[PDB]
PDB file of C-alpha atoms in Angstrom:
ATOM      1  CA  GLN A   1       0.002  -0.027   0.035  1.00 44.08           C
ATOM      2  CA  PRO A   2       1.192   3.610  -0.890  1.00 46.57           C
ATOM      3  CA  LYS A   3       1.127   6.098   2.092  1.00 43.21           C
ATOM      4  CA  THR A   4       0.442   9.805   1.364  1.00 40.71           C
ATOM      5  CA  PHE A   5      -0.659  13.214   2.649  1.00 40.03           C
ATOM      6  CA  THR A   6      -2.822  16.017   1.257  1.00 44.81           C
ATOM      7  CA  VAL A   7      -2.104  19.300  -0.668  1.00 43.09           C
ATOM      8  CA  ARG A   8      -4.016  22.205  -1.974  1.00 45.72           C
ATOM      9  CA  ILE A   9      -3.070  23.722  -5.250  1.00 42.51           C
ATOM     10  CA  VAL A  10      -4.416  27.244  -5.948  1.00 41.21           C
ATOM     11  CA  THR A  11      -4.526  28.852  -9.361  1.00 47.00           C
ATOM     12  CA  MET A  12      -5.751  32.312 -10.394  1.00 46.67           C
ATOM     13  CA  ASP A  13      -9.318  30.886 -10.735  1.00 44.59           C
ATOM     14  CA  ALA A  14      -9.236  27.340  -9.250  1.00 42.57           C
ATOM     15  CA  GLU A  15      -8.290  25.454  -6.093  1.00 41.39           C
ATOM     16  CA  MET A  16      -7.342  21.753  -6.115  1.00 38.88           C
ATOM     17  CA  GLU A  17      -6.636  19.259  -3.413  1.00 39.95           C
ATOM     18  CA  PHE A  18      -4.206  16.480  -4.124  1.00 41.54           C
ATOM     19  CA  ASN A  19      -2.719  13.357  -2.652  1.00 39.65           C
ATOM     20  CA  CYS A  20       0.968  13.925  -2.784  1.00 39.83           C
ATOM     21  CA  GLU A  21       3.041  10.910  -1.543  1.00 40.10           C
ATOM     22  CA  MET A  22       5.257  11.357   1.419  1.00 40.78           C
ATOM     23  CA  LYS A  23       8.623  10.731  -0.442  1.00 39.69           C
ATOM     24  CA  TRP A  24       7.400  12.680  -3.467  1.00 37.95           C
ATOM     25  CA  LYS A  25       9.634  15.277  -5.200  1.00 37.34           C
ATOM     26  CA  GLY A  26       8.900  18.712  -6.453  1.00 34.63           C
ATOM     27  CA  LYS A  27       8.866  17.561 -10.063  1.00 30.59           C
ATOM     28  CA  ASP A  28       6.612  14.580  -9.302  1.00 29.31           C
ATOM     29  CA  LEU A  29       3.995  16.878  -7.770  1.00 30.03           C
ATOM     30  CA  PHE A  30       4.355  19.692 -10.305  1.00 30.12           C
ATOM     31  CA  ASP A  31       3.777  17.428 -13.119  1.00 28.26           C
ATOM     32  CA  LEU A  32       0.725  15.834 -11.492  1.00 31.68           C
ATOM     33  CA  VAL A  33      -0.622  19.376 -11.290  1.00 30.18           C
ATOM     34  CA  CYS A  34       0.355  20.257 -14.905  1.00 27.53           C
ATOM     35  CA  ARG A  35      -1.399  17.104 -16.158  1.00 26.51           C
ATOM     36  CA  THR A  36      -4.735  17.602 -14.400  1.00 29.54           C
ATOM     37  CA  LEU A  37      -4.669  21.061 -15.707  1.00 29.90           C
ATOM     38  CA  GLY A  38      -3.976  20.048 -19.403  1.00 34.07           C
ATOM     39  CA  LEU A  39      -1.112  22.530 -19.403  1.00 34.69           C
ATOM     40  CA  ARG A  40       2.000  21.396 -21.168  1.00 33.36           C
ATOM     41  CA  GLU A  41       3.942  24.703 -21.567  1.00 33.97           C
ATOM     42  CA  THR A  42       5.078  23.968 -18.060  1.00 35.42           C
ATOM     43  CA  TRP A  43       8.395  25.910 -18.246  1.00 32.80           C
ATOM     44  CA  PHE A  44       6.668  29.196 -17.411  1.00 32.60           C
ATOM     45  CA  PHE A  45       5.164  28.153 -14.078  1.00 33.49           C
ATOM     46  CA  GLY A  46       6.161  26.611 -10.744  1.00 31.38           C
ATOM     47  CA  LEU A  47       4.427  26.187  -7.330  1.00 31.74           C
ATOM     48  CA  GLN A  48       5.041  28.668  -4.509  1.00 29.40           C
ATOM     49  CA  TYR A  49       4.420  28.590  -0.885  1.00 33.53           C
ATOM     50  CA  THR A  50       5.378  31.486   1.352  1.00 37.53           C
ATOM     51  CA  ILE A  51       6.935  31.734   4.874  1.00 39.26           C
ATOM     52  CA  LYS A  52       6.042  35.445   5.590  1.00 40.27           C
ATOM     53  CA  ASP A  53       9.251  37.277   4.637  1.00 40.41           C
ATOM     54  CA  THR A  54      11.202  35.761   1.714  1.00 41.66           C
ATOM     55  CA  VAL A  55       8.883  33.735  -0.592  1.00 42.64           C
ATOM     56  CA  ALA A  56       9.849  30.413  -2.246  1.00 38.31           C
ATOM     57  CA  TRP A  57       9.551  28.172  -5.268  1.00 37.04           C
ATOM     58  CA  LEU A  58       9.191  24.424  -5.039  1.00 36.22           C
ATOM     59  CA  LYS A  59      12.529  22.862  -6.180  1.00 36.30           C
ATOM     60  CA  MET A  60      12.210  20.062  -8.662  1.00 37.32           C
ATOM     61  CA  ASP A  61      15.108  18.257  -6.847  1.00 34.90           C
ATOM     62  CA  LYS A  62      14.113  18.378  -3.116  1.00 34.21           C
ATOM     63  CA  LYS A  63      11.335  16.389  -1.498  1.00 31.30           C
ATOM     64  CA  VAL A  64       8.176  18.506  -1.094  1.00 31.54           C
ATOM     65  CA  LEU A  65       8.256  17.898   2.555  1.00 32.23           C
ATOM     66  CA  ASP A  66      11.987  18.862   2.922  1.00 27.37           C
ATOM     67  CA  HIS A  67      11.224  22.385   1.677  1.00 28.78           C
ATOM     68  CA  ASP A  68      10.721  24.576   4.751  1.00 26.75           C
ATOM     69  CA  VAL A  69       7.020  24.775   3.795  1.00 26.71           C
ATOM     70  CA  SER A  70       4.300  25.079   6.474  1.00 25.29           C
ATOM     71  CA  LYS A  71       3.395  21.376   7.137  1.00 27.02           C
ATOM     72  CA  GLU A  72      -0.264  21.826   8.241  1.00 29.35           C
ATOM     73  CA  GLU A  73      -2.607  19.753   6.061  1.00 28.47           C
ATOM     74  CA  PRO A  74      -3.476  20.747   3.453  1.00 29.56           C
ATOM     75  CA  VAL A  75      -0.039  21.926   2.462  1.00 22.70           C
ATOM     76  CA  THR A  76      -0.599  24.861   0.248  1.00 24.10           C
ATOM     77  CA  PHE A  77       1.140  25.774  -2.958  1.00 22.14           C
ATOM     78  CA  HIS A  78       0.201  28.548  -5.317  1.00 22.13           C
ATOM     79  CA  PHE A  79       0.439  27.611  -9.019  1.00 21.05           C
ATOM     80  CA  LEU A  80       1.915  30.668 -10.802  1.00 20.26           C
ATOM     81  CA  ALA A  81       3.924  31.861 -13.723  1.00 19.72           C
ATOM     82  CA  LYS A  82       7.518  32.225 -12.586  1.00 18.45           C
ATOM     83  CA  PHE A  83       8.600  33.214 -16.014  1.00 16.28           C
ATOM     84  CA  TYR A  84       7.257  35.593 -18.634  1.00 17.30           C
ATOM     85  CA  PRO A  85       7.487  35.512 -22.436  1.00 17.66           C
ATOM     86  CA  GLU A  86       9.021  38.243 -24.517  1.00 19.38           C
ATOM     87  CA  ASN A  87       5.894  37.977 -26.839  1.00 18.49           C
ATOM     88  CA  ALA A  88       2.774  36.230 -25.510  1.00 19.50           C
ATOM     89  CA  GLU A  89       1.011  36.169 -28.914  1.00 17.92           C
ATOM     90  CA  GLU A  90       3.937  34.165 -30.212  1.00 20.64           C
ATOM     91  CA  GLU A  91       4.969  32.173 -27.146  1.00 18.71           C
ATOM     92  CA  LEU A  92       1.724  31.134 -25.525  1.00 18.59           C
ATOM     93  CA  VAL A  93       0.099  28.607 -27.557  1.00 16.23           C
ATOM     94  CA  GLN A  94      -2.360  26.811 -25.296  1.00 18.19           C
ATOM     95  CA  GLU A  95      -5.550  28.785 -24.340  1.00 17.39           C
ATOM     96  CA  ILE A  96      -4.966  27.341 -20.904  1.00 16.72           C
ATOM     97  CA  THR A  97      -1.562  28.887 -20.685  1.00 15.81           C
ATOM     98  CA  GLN A  98      -2.856  32.207 -22.095  1.00 17.45           C
ATOM     99  CA  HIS A  99      -5.730  32.137 -19.627  1.00 19.18           C
ATOM    100  CA  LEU A 100      -3.397  31.586 -16.533  1.00 18.95           C
ATOM    101  CA  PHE A 101      -1.300  34.452 -17.686  1.00 21.38           C
ATOM    102  CA  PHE A 102      -4.277  36.743 -18.480  1.00 22.89           C
ATOM    103  CA  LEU A 103      -5.749  36.291 -14.930  1.00 25.03           C
ATOM    104  CA  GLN A 104      -2.356  36.524 -13.089  1.00 26.54           C
ATOM    105  CA  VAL A 105      -1.286  39.741 -14.824  1.00 26.78           C
ATOM    106  CA  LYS A 106      -4.795  41.220 -14.501  1.00 29.29           C
ATOM    107  CA  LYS A 107      -4.332  40.837 -10.707  1.00 29.95           C
ATOM    108  CA  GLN A 108      -0.907  42.395 -10.895  1.00 29.61           C
ATOM    109  CA  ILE A 109      -2.436  45.375 -12.714  1.00 29.54           C
ATOM    110  CA  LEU A 110      -5.396  45.623 -10.419  1.00 27.77           C
ATOM    111  CA  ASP A 111      -3.482  45.417  -7.163  1.00 24.29           C
ATOM    112  CA  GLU A 112      -1.081  47.976  -8.725  1.00 26.18           C
ATOM    113  CA  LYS A 113       1.930  45.757  -8.686  1.00 27.59           C
ATOM    114  CA  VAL A 114       2.598  46.814 -12.212  1.00 29.57           C
ATOM    115  CA  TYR A 115       2.094  50.411 -13.134  1.00 30.54           C
ATOM    116  CA  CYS A 116      -0.390  51.158 -15.833  1.00 27.42           C
ATOM    117  CA  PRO A 117      -1.471  54.602 -17.159  1.00 27.69           C
ATOM    118  CA  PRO A 118      -5.135  55.690 -17.112  1.00 29.50           C
ATOM    119  CA  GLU A 119      -6.006  55.371 -20.854  1.00 25.81           C
ATOM    120  CA  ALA A 120      -4.257  51.970 -21.020  1.00 25.49           C
ATOM    121  CA  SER A 121      -6.012  50.442 -17.993  1.00 24.62           C
ATOM    122  CA  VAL A 122      -9.256  51.600 -19.495  1.00 27.07           C
ATOM    123  CA  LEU A 123      -8.482  49.880 -22.760  1.00 24.80           C
ATOM    124  CA  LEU A 124      -7.383  46.838 -20.684  1.00 23.86           C
ATOM    125  CA  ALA A 125     -10.418  46.802 -18.572  1.00 26.69           C
ATOM    126  CA  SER A 126     -12.437  46.961 -21.801  1.00 27.48           C
ATOM    127  CA  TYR A 127     -10.813  43.657 -23.104  1.00 28.24           C
ATOM    128  CA  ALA A 128     -11.336  42.006 -19.730  1.00 28.33           C
ATOM    129  CA  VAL A 129     -15.139  42.440 -19.756  1.00 28.14           C
ATOM    130  CA  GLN A 130     -15.313  41.281 -23.372  1.00 31.90           C
ATOM    131  CA  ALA A 131     -13.692  37.949 -22.330  1.00 30.54           C
ATOM    132  CA  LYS A 132     -16.009  37.708 -19.270  1.00 32.32           C
ATOM    133  CA  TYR A 133     -19.283  39.336 -20.468  1.00 29.92           C
ATOM    134  CA  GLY A 134     -19.127  38.492 -24.169  1.00 33.00           C
ATOM    135  CA  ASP A 135     -20.320  40.764 -27.074  1.00 31.29           C
ATOM    136  CA  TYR A 136     -21.875  44.048 -26.030  1.00 30.87           C
ATOM    137  CA  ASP A 137     -25.656  44.371 -25.984  1.00 33.77           C
ATOM    138  CA  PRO A 138     -27.121  47.957 -25.136  1.00 33.04           C
ATOM    139  CA  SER A 139     -30.353  46.361 -23.870  1.00 33.72           C
ATOM    140  CA  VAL A 140     -29.024  43.485 -21.700  1.00 31.56           C
ATOM    141  CA  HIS A 141     -26.043  45.655 -20.584  1.00 30.33           C
ATOM    142  CA  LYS A 142     -27.981  48.548 -19.116  1.00 30.18           C
ATOM    143  CA  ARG A 143     -26.049  51.436 -17.428  1.00 32.48           C
ATOM    144  CA  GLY A 144     -24.653  50.482 -14.034  1.00 34.79           C
ATOM    145  CA  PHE A 145     -24.026  46.851 -14.802  1.00 34.39           C
ATOM    146  CA  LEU A 146     -20.364  47.704 -14.237  1.00 31.37           C
ATOM    147  CA  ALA A 147     -21.057  49.452 -10.974  1.00 25.04           C
ATOM    148  CA  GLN A 148     -19.014  47.632  -8.351  1.00 25.87           C
ATOM    149  CA  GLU A 149     -16.655  45.337 -10.292  1.00 25.68           C
ATOM    150  CA  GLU A 150     -12.972  46.232  -9.713  1.00 28.54           C
ATOM    151  CA  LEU A 151     -12.140  47.085 -13.356  1.00 27.59           C
ATOM    152  CA  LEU A 152      -9.470  49.766 -13.303  1.00 24.47           C
ATOM    153  CA  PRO A 153      -6.738  49.896 -10.571  1.00 23.01           C
ATOM    154  CA  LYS A 154      -7.513  52.059  -7.550  1.00 24.38           C
ATOM    155  CA  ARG A 155      -5.148  54.776  -8.669  1.00 25.93           C
ATOM    156  CA  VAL A 156      -6.681  55.841 -12.001  1.00 26.20           C
ATOM    157  CA  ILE A 157     -10.256  55.965 -10.712  1.00 25.38           C
ATOM    158  CA  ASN A 158      -8.933  58.258  -7.973  1.00 27.56           C
ATOM    159  CA  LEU A 159      -7.917  60.476 -10.810  1.00 28.66           C
ATOM    160  CA  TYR A 160     -10.542  62.807  -9.407  1.00 29.39           C
ATOM    161  CA  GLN A 161     -11.476  64.857 -12.573  1.00 28.29           C
ATOM    162  CA  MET A 162     -13.649  61.842 -13.512  1.00 27.34           C
ATOM    163  CA  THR A 163     -16.480  60.104 -11.563  1.00 26.69           C
ATOM    164  CA  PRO A 164     -17.140  56.404 -10.724  1.00 27.68           C
ATOM    165  CA  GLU A 165     -19.746  55.368 -13.378  1.00 29.96           C
ATOM    166  CA  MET A 166     -18.265  57.904 -15.776  1.00 30.46           C
ATOM    167  CA  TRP A 167     -15.389  55.496 -16.046  1.00 32.75           C
ATOM    168  CA  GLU A 168     -18.110  52.930 -16.958  1.00 31.85           C
ATOM    169  CA  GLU A 169     -18.731  54.791 -20.172  1.00 33.80           C
ATOM    170  CA  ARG A 170     -15.088  55.135 -21.135  1.00 31.83           C
ATOM    171  CA  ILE A 171     -14.792  51.309 -20.875  1.00 27.96           C
ATOM    172  CA  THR A 172     -18.260  50.662 -22.367  1.00 29.45           C
ATOM    173  CA  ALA A 173     -17.160  52.778 -25.402  1.00 30.11           C
ATOM    174  CA  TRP A 174     -14.218  50.447 -26.181  1.00 32.50           C
ATOM    175  CA  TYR A 175     -16.175  47.226 -25.201  1.00 33.48           C
ATOM    176  CA  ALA A 176     -18.801  48.212 -27.866  1.00 34.68           C
ATOM    177  CA  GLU A 177     -16.025  48.045 -30.516  1.00 32.98           C
ATOM    178  CA  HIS A 178     -14.816  44.672 -29.317  1.00 33.36           C
ATOM    179  CA  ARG A 179     -17.921  42.948 -30.771  1.00 35.62           C
ATOM    180  CA  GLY A 180     -17.129  39.571 -32.315  1.00 36.94           C
ATOM    181  CA  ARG A 181     -14.139  38.840 -30.102  1.00 37.78           C
ATOM    182  CA  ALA A 182     -13.616  35.430 -28.679  1.00 37.15           C
ATOM    183  CA  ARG A 183     -12.971  35.061 -24.910  1.00 39.60           C
ATOM    184  CA  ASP A 184      -9.437  33.798 -25.534  1.00 38.09           C
ATOM    185  CA  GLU A 185      -8.851  36.379 -28.263  1.00 37.53           C
ATOM    186  CA  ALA A 186      -9.829  39.257 -25.911  1.00 35.49           C
ATOM    187  CA  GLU A 187      -7.394  37.755 -23.289  1.00 32.13           C
ATOM    188  CA  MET A 188      -4.560  37.756 -25.752  1.00 32.97           C
ATOM    189  CA  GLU A 189      -5.335  41.289 -26.717  1.00 36.87           C
ATOM    190  CA  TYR A 190      -5.168  42.229 -23.051  1.00 39.48           C
ATOM    191  CA  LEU A 191      -1.776  40.546 -22.912  1.00 36.38           C
ATOM    192  CA  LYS A 192      -0.328  42.419 -25.980  1.00 37.99           C
ATOM    193  CA  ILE A 193      -1.074  45.710 -24.311  1.00 37.86           C
ATOM    194  CA  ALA A 194       0.344  44.465 -20.981  1.00 37.99           C
ATOM    195  CA  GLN A 195       3.619  43.084 -22.335  1.00 37.23           C
ATOM    196  CA  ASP A 196       4.623  46.572 -23.256  1.00 38.89           C
ATOM    197  CA  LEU A 197       4.140  48.040 -19.744  1.00 37.93           C
ATOM    198  CA  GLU A 198       7.384  49.247 -18.067  1.00 38.86           C
ATOM    199  CA  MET A 199       7.052  46.968 -14.942  1.00 38.63           C
ATOM    200  CA  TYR A 200       5.736  43.980 -16.821  1.00 40.22           C
ATOM    201  CA  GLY A 201       7.255  40.650 -15.882  1.00 40.36           C
ATOM    202  CA  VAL A 202      10.109  42.163 -13.945  1.00 40.74           C
ATOM    203  CA  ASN A 203      11.277  40.915 -10.609  1.00 42.57           C
ATOM    204  CA  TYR A 204      12.424  43.613  -8.318  1.00 36.67           C
ATOM    205  CA  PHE A 205      15.133  43.190  -5.746  1.00 36.16           C
ATOM    206  CA  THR A 206      16.901  45.370  -3.252  1.00 34.27           C
ATOM    207  CA  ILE A 207      20.643  45.440  -3.676  1.00 34.58           C
ATOM    208  CA  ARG A 208      23.313  48.165  -3.001  1.00 37.82           C
ATOM    209  CA  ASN A 209      26.744  48.917  -4.581  1.00 39.85           C
ATOM    210  CA  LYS A 210      30.225  48.429  -3.096  1.00 39.80           C
ATOM    211  CA  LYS A 211      30.076  52.049  -1.947  1.00 40.84           C
ATOM    212  CA  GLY A 212      26.786  51.676  -0.032  1.00 38.36           C
ATOM    213  CA  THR A 213      24.327  53.352  -2.368  1.00 40.09           C
ATOM    214  CA  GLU A 214      20.860  51.916  -2.475  1.00 40.35           C
ATOM    215  CA  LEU A 215      19.787  50.657  -5.954  1.00 40.35           C
ATOM    216  CA  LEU A 216      17.225  48.213  -7.345  1.00 39.89           C
ATOM    217  CA  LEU A 217      17.678  44.945  -9.248  1.00 43.03           C
ATOM    218  CA  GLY A 218      15.493  43.959 -12.126  1.00 43.00           C
ATOM    219  CA  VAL A 219      15.335  40.358 -13.399  1.00 39.54           C
ATOM    220  CA  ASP A 220      13.301  39.768 -16.567  1.00 42.14           C
ATOM    221  CA  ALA A 221      12.856  38.162 -19.920  1.00 42.45           C
ATOM    222  CA  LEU A 222      15.238  40.671 -21.458  1.00 46.14           C
ATOM    223  CA  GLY A 223      18.245  40.892 -19.059  1.00 44.82           C
ATOM    224  CA  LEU A 224      19.568  42.255 -15.771  1.00 40.51           C
ATOM    225  CA  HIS A 225      18.624  45.782 -14.794  1.00 40.08           C
ATOM    226  CA  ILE A 226      19.984  48.339 -12.315  1.00 38.31           C
ATOM    227  CA  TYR A 227      17.378  50.967 -11.192  1.00 39.19           C
ATOM    228  CA  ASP A 228      17.238  54.138  -9.056  1.00 39.66           C
ATOM    229  CA  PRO A 229      14.757  53.182  -6.252  1.00 37.16           C
ATOM    230  CA  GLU A 230      12.952  56.369  -7.183  1.00 36.92           C
ATOM    231  CA  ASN A 231      12.172  55.103 -10.793  1.00 37.29           C
ATOM    232  CA  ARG A 232      10.879  51.528 -11.386  1.00 38.85           C
ATOM    233  CA  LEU A 233       9.866  52.296 -15.015  1.00 35.40           C
ATOM    234  CA  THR A 234      13.262  53.147 -16.465  1.00 33.50           C
ATOM    235  CA  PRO A 235      16.571  51.408 -15.712  1.00 34.05           C
ATOM    236  CA  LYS A 236      19.776  53.362 -15.435  1.00 34.44           C
ATOM    237  CA  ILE A 237      21.749  50.506 -17.020  1.00 34.30           C
ATOM    238  CA  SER A 238      20.649  47.271 -18.634  1.00 34.01           C
ATOM    239  CA  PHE A 239      22.545  44.045 -19.147  1.00 33.57           C
ATOM    240  CA  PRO A 240      20.977  41.805 -21.809  1.00 33.04           C
ATOM    241  CA  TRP A 241      21.355  38.054 -21.241  1.00 35.72           C
ATOM    242  CA  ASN A 242      23.129  37.723 -24.602  1.00 35.58           C
ATOM    243  CA  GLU A 243      25.530  40.568 -23.618  1.00 37.65           C
ATOM    244  CA  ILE A 244      26.554  38.912 -20.351  1.00 42.34           C
ATOM    245  CA  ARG A 245      29.034  36.058 -20.230  1.00 40.70           C
ATOM    246  CA  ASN A 246      28.854  35.042 -16.510  1.00 42.02           C
ATOM    247  CA  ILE A 247      27.303  36.080 -13.164  1.00 40.71           C
ATOM    248  CA  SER A 248      29.573  35.150 -10.245  1.00 40.82           C
ATOM    249  CA  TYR A 249      28.524  35.220  -6.598  1.00 40.15           C
ATOM    250  CA  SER A 250      30.990  34.887  -3.605  1.00 41.62           C
ATOM    251  CA  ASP A 251      30.142  35.659   0.070  1.00 40.57           C
ATOM    252  CA  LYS A 252      27.263  38.128  -0.555  1.00 38.25           C
ATOM    253  CA  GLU A 253      28.294  39.983  -3.796  1.00 38.62           C
ATOM    254  CA  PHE A 254      26.999  39.498  -7.432  1.00 38.63           C
ATOM    255  CA  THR A 255      29.472  40.336 -10.151  1.00 39.58           C
ATOM    256  CA  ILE A 256      27.988  40.640 -13.657  1.00 38.81           C
ATOM    257  CA  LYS A 257      30.770  39.779 -15.973  1.00 38.05           C
ATOM    258  CA  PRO A 258      29.798  41.165 -19.492  1.00 38.77           C
ATOM    259  CA  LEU A 259      31.161  39.664 -22.683  1.00 36.53           C
ATOM    260  CA  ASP A 260      33.553  42.134 -24.490  1.00 37.57           C
ATOM    261  CA  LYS A 261      36.027  42.595 -21.616  1.00 35.55           C
ATOM    262  CA  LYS A 262      36.739  45.846 -23.386  1.00 33.32           C
ATOM    263  CA  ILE A 263      33.449  47.203 -22.004  1.00 35.26           C
ATOM    264  CA  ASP A 264      33.053  46.817 -18.164  1.00 36.91           C
ATOM    265  CA  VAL A 265      32.448  44.724 -14.973  1.00 38.96           C
ATOM    266  CA  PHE A 266      29.567  45.535 -12.668  1.00 39.62           C
ATOM    267  CA  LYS A 267      29.147  44.411  -9.024  1.00 37.74           C
ATOM    268  CA  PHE A 268      26.578  44.612  -6.126  1.00 35.71           C
ATOM    269  CA  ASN A 269      25.773  43.487  -2.601  1.00 36.24           C
ATOM    270  CA  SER A 270      22.619  42.018  -1.151  1.00 37.67           C
ATOM    271  CA  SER A 271      22.491  39.836   1.968  1.00 36.52           C
ATOM    272  CA  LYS A 272      19.714  37.252   2.489  1.00 37.63           C
ATOM    273  CA  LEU A 273      20.831  33.734   1.543  1.00 40.78           C
ATOM    274  CA  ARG A 274      17.291  33.078   0.262  1.00 38.50           C
ATOM    275  CA  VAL A 275      16.618  36.090  -1.943  1.00 40.82           C
ATOM    276  CA  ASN A 276      20.203  35.686  -3.302  1.00 41.28           C
ATOM    277  CA  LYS A 277      18.940  32.136  -4.120  1.00 44.30           C
ATOM    278  CA  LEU A 278      15.842  33.364  -5.800  1.00 44.84           C
ATOM    279  CA  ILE A 279      17.884  35.875  -7.815  1.00 45.12           C
ATOM    280  CA  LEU A 280      20.044  33.158  -9.069  1.00 46.03           C
ATOM    281  CA  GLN A 281      17.266  30.650  -9.922  1.00 45.98           C
ATOM    282  CA  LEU A 282      15.633  33.449 -12.000  1.00 45.94           C
ATOM    283  CA  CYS A 283      18.787  34.238 -13.736  1.00 50.84           C
ATOM    284  CA  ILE A 284      19.493  30.885 -15.347  1.00 52.89           C
ATOM    285  CA  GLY A 285      15.765  30.580 -16.041  1.00 52.36           C
ATOM    286  CA  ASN A 286      15.355  33.844 -17.982  1.00 53.00           C
ATOM    287  CA  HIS A 287      18.773  33.079 -19.492  1.00 54.53           C
ATOM    288  CA  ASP A 288      17.653  29.965 -21.284  1.00 55.69           C
ATOM    289  CA  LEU A 289      14.205  30.882 -22.384  1.00 56.76           C
ATOM    290  CA  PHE A 290      15.792  34.107 -23.765  1.00 58.06           C
ATOM    291  CA  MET A 291      18.242  31.837 -25.672  1.00 57.36           C
ATOM    292  CA  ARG A 292      15.649  29.268 -26.749  1.00 55.82           C
ATOM    293  CA  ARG A 293      13.442  32.044 -28.148  1.00 54.29           C
ATOM    294  CA  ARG A 294      16.425  32.988 -30.511  1.00 52.62           C
ATOM    295  CA  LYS A 295      16.723  29.415 -31.699  1.00 52.87           C
ATOM    296  CA  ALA A 296      14.550  27.003 -33.603  1.00 54.83           C
ATOM    297  CA  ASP A 297      11.429  25.609 -31.852  1.00 53.19           C
ATOM    298  CA  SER A 298      11.733  22.203 -30.222  1.00 52.61           C
ATOM    299  CA  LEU A 299       9.656  19.315 -31.463  1.00 53.93           C
ATOM    300  CA  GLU A 300       7.622  19.763 -28.351  1.00 55.55           C
ATOM    301  CA  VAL A 301       6.826  23.331 -29.328  1.00 55.89           C
ATOM    302  CA  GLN A 302       6.587  23.057 -33.098  1.00 55.77           C
ATOM    303  CA  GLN A 303       3.943  20.313 -32.672  1.00 56.82           C
ATOM    304  CA  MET A 304       1.889  22.556 -30.501  1.00 60.34           C
ATOM    305  CA  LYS A 305       1.988  25.482 -32.889  1.00 63.66           C
ATOM    306  CA  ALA A 306       0.932  23.122 -35.551  1.00 65.37           C
ATOM    307  CA  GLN A 307      -2.045  21.746 -33.588  1.00 64.07           C
ATOM    308  CA  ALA A 308      -3.158  25.348 -33.202  1.00 65.18           C
ATOM    309  CA  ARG A 309      -2.662  26.084 -36.969  1.00 65.33           C
ATOM    310  CA  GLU A 310      -4.936  22.970 -37.681  1.00 66.11           C
ATOM    311  CA  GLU A 311      -7.554  23.536 -34.934  1.00 64.59           C
ATOM    312  CA  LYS A 312      -8.012  27.205 -35.979  1.00 62.65           C
ATOM    313  CA  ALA A 313      -8.410  26.547 -39.653  1.00 65.93           C
ATOM    314  CA  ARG A 314     -10.710  23.627 -38.646  1.00 68.12           C
ATOM    315  CA  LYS A 315     -12.921  25.816 -36.612  1.00 65.91           C
ATOM    316  CA  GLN A 316     -12.729  28.182 -39.621  1.00 66.24           C
ATOM    317  CA  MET A 317     -13.655  25.739 -42.337  1.00 65.16           C
ATOM    318  CA  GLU A 318     -16.471  24.005 -40.387  1.00 67.35           C
ATOM    319  CA  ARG A 319     -17.814  27.580 -39.792  1.00 68.11           C
ATOM    320  CA  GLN A 320     -17.889  28.757 -43.418  1.00 65.76           C
ATOM    321  CA  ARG A 321     -18.783  25.282 -44.834  1.00 68.39           C
ATOM    322  CA  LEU A 322     -21.761  25.105 -42.494  1.00 68.26           C
ATOM    323  CA  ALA A 323     -23.574  28.314 -43.420  1.00 68.76           C
TER     324      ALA A 323
END
């Protein structure tokens, strides 16, 4: 007989309970979760618990129990995108994948984790209700239907010169134009707009230089960024993954070694053995996807993009040759 314990897996819309074996590893669990979800573009996600201070990602090598995760049943893990694509419309094939990104980012926008200007958030909110509510209908969708709904982040609505349900018009004006858009199509549209945001998909970290000046570290799909803590939108310097050769780390200091030794050598301190772990994990991660993007698609990927090419034209031929 196989002995086991229970776990809860929360997604941006679901919550699952599972029977993870005692001696099971991070990978074993993860995969179980990816399968029941029907998600195969796994490389973007990972499961995450949280102590209270530094947060963590389930390691595919260690036993799920060995991770210093709160052991009270049901053990909780949040299924989330750890990595972000440089171009969603080209890198997210599965609607499932797209969906999980759509909802996650939406929350990041709404809770103001990622800065979004007024006009944009309005456009965004307009795509969100097209996915949720479907095509517009002046009759069914009477004024006020978007009263209390959490559509724009709390900062733009507090842009005083405009009133609560006035915003409802601004959004309803766009939504009207979205007629004919599929739930998943509207979600992708939301993403296109989102990719472009200055704070989109960037991991922020607190680090300081060898002289003691407080800076900000940015780890993302594009490279390694050094920011002025008073400006999260625009980096002072940027180190693309293809421009860097190596990233050493001794004691408590990272030392970005750029290729072209004729250029430079940057360095910075940060002390928290866990964050410094996160930073590293994230580095190799973004480093490979970045590289894989540049190169030819793996059979695993090229097959997916094909399935989509065939199950799109299919829906298209059986729609025309059926009317």
